[PDB]
Amino acid sequence: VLYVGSKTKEGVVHGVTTVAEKTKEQVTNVGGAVVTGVTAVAQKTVEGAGSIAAATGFVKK
Amino acid sequence: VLYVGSKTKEGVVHGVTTVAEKTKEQVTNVGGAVVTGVTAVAQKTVEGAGSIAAATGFVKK
Amino acid sequence: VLYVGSKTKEGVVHGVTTVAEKTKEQVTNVGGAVVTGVTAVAQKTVEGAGSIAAATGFVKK
Amino acid sequence: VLYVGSKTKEGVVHGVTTVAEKTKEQVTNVGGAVVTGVTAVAQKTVEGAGSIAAATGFVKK
Amino acid sequence: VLYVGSKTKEGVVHGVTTVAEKTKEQVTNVGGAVVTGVTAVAQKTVEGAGSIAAATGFVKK
Amino acid sequence: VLYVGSKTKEGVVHGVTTVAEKTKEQVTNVGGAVVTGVTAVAQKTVEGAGSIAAATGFVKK
């Protein structure tokens, strides 16, 4: 890989905004996965054979 | 891979916005996945054979 | 692959917006996979054999 | 005025919102009035004869 | 004036959202009034012989 | 004026949220008024003959 005089963005995440003033969450999980709210996942390169890169709310049995 | 004088951008997520004033959330998940809200996932390169890159609300058995 | 003085976008997600004032959600998942809300998934390359790139609300058996 | 139990609003401004990501303003005012933004104005009563209540962008020669 | 359990709205504004992704304003002004944005006036009572309630972009001579 | 359990809003302004990432103003005003941003104005009563209640970008000669 060669760059000269370049400005490039790879796997970047930015400017994630949320606005509220009243919010209630009543999660009652027992055995799985519950994801609520804001999250940011940003990779550039991952190598694997059966791997999971960006899991949000994942169960595997 | 060669770049000269380029302003490319690759695998970006930006400017995701949610505006509210009243939110209420009730979940009663027992055995799977319940993802609710805002999630921002961005990659450039993934390698695999049985890989999963961006899993959101994923259940596998 | 070579670039000379080019501005380009590859695999991007921008300017996704939701606006509301009242949101009420009562999901009661019993073992499947429920996704509600906003998610932003963006890659450039996905290499696999039986891979999954962007799964949102995915159940597998 | 004899409220004996009621949920009321009397002259309110709520939930004004503006979404953008690129914005440029160029104003070269010389002798007047220029308004280029977001303004929220709300009253209940005004009095008097020569009265101005909401004067967003007003010139009075 | 009486209210014995009545939910009422008296002169309000809401849900006046606006959305864009590229704005550029180049107003040039010398002698008048210019308004080039979003404004929300919500009043209940105004009175007077020469009253002006909601003037947006007003010139008076 | 009498209240025995009325839940009342009388001249309020809430939730005027605006969102951007890139913003640039180039104001070159002379001898006048220029307003380019966010303002919140909320009154209940103003009393007076020659009265101005909510002036935003006002010039009187």
Side-chain angles (χ1 to χ4, degrees):
Chain A
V1 179
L2 277 296
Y3 304 145
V4 300
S6 293
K7 185 252 170 163
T8 186
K9 274 162 202 323
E10 317 296 350
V12 60
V13 74
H14 71 96
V16 185
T17 179
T18 174
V19 174
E21 74 272 10
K22 294 215 321 163
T23 296
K24 273 172 211 202
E25 276 82 3
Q26 320 269 339
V27 178
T28 61
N29 207 48
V30 304
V34 167
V35 181
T36 300
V38 64
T39 187
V41 179
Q43 293 82 17
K44 174 202 151 93
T45 306
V46 54
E47 301 86 40
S51 296
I52 297 89
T56 290
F58 203 106
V59 305
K60 44 172 281 173
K61 293 180 179 179
Chain B
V1 173
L2 277 296
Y3 289 60
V4 309
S6 284
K7 189 269 161 163
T8 182
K9 81 169 80 72
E10 294 174 354
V12 72
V13 174
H14 67 111
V16 53
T17 187
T18 62
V19 171
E21 72 155 50
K22 254 173 81 153
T23 61
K24 264 162 201 203
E25 283 211 35
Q26 293 104 10
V27 306
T28 60
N29 187 77
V30 306
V34 177
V35 176
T36 310
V38 61
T39 68
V41 180
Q43 282 98 299
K44 183 178 184 293
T45 314
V46 64
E47 281 86 39
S51 44
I52 297 89
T56 301
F58 206 101
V59 57
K60 105 172 191 183
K61 302 135 160 184
Chain C
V1 174
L2 172 143
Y3 292 60
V4 168
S6 290
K7 184 241 171 192
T8 179
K9 273 172 270 283
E10 280 135 20
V12 305
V13 175
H14 72 93
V16 59
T17 175
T18 63
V19 59
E21 81 165 69
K22 272 169 81 205
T23 300
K24 216 182 261 193
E25 299 176 357
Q26 286 102 9
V27 62
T28 54
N29 181 86
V30 161
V34 176
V35 169
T36 300
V38 64
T39 181
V41 176
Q43 293 94 290
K44 163 144 169 83
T45 61
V46 175
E47 290 98 29
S51 50
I52 297 105
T56 310
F58 202 106
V59 61
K60 186 152 139 62
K61 293 179 179 179
Chain D
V1 192
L2 297 173
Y3 293 61
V4 69
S6 289
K7 195 238 173 181
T8 72
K9 308 160 159 73
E10 294 161 54
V12 304
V13 167
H14 76 80
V16 62
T17 183
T18 300
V19 176
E21 73 271 12
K22 253 173 92 162
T23 300
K24 272 172 220 202
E25 298 292 331
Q26 273 96 20
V27 300
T28 61
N29 196 46
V30 176
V34 176
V35 171
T36 61
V38 57
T39 60
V41 186
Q43 293 104 240
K44 193 162 130 62
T45 66
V46 310
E47 309 311 320
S51 66
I52 306 106
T56 300
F58 200 114
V59 58
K60 186 183 122 153
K61 274 142 180 193
Chain E
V1 174
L2 266 290
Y3 300 81
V4 298
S6 55
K7 194 243 171 173
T8 191
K9 246 65 166 182
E10 315 286 12
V12 303
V13 65
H14 63 269
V16 60
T17 182
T18 187
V19 57
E21 86 281 23
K22 250 175 81 170
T23 79
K24 225 172 271 193
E25 301 197 347
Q26 283 104 20
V27 64
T28 61
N29 190 44
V30 59
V34 186
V35 168
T36 61
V38 290
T39 180
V41 183
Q43 317 193 110
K44 174 70 168 65
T45 61
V46 298
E47 71 304 341
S51 65
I52 304 142
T56 300
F58 202 97
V59 185
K60 151 170 163 172
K61 293 179 179 179
Chain F
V1 178
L2 180 63
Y3 293 64
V4 309
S6 302
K7 190 263 185 179
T8 59
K9 274 145 191 154
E10 280 154 70
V12 301
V13 172
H14 68 93
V16 300
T17 62
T18 190
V19 58
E21 52 206 40
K22 224 174 149 174
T23 300
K24 199 178 313 200
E25 286 87 1
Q26 304 284 330
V27 54
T28 61
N29 170 69
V30 61
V34 164
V35 172
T36 61
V38 64
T39 67
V41 176
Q43 293 82 17
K44 192 205 210 273
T45 61
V46 302
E47 284 99 30
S51 66
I52 295 93
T56 301
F58 198 108
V59 54
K60 43 171 310 173
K61 274 142 171 193

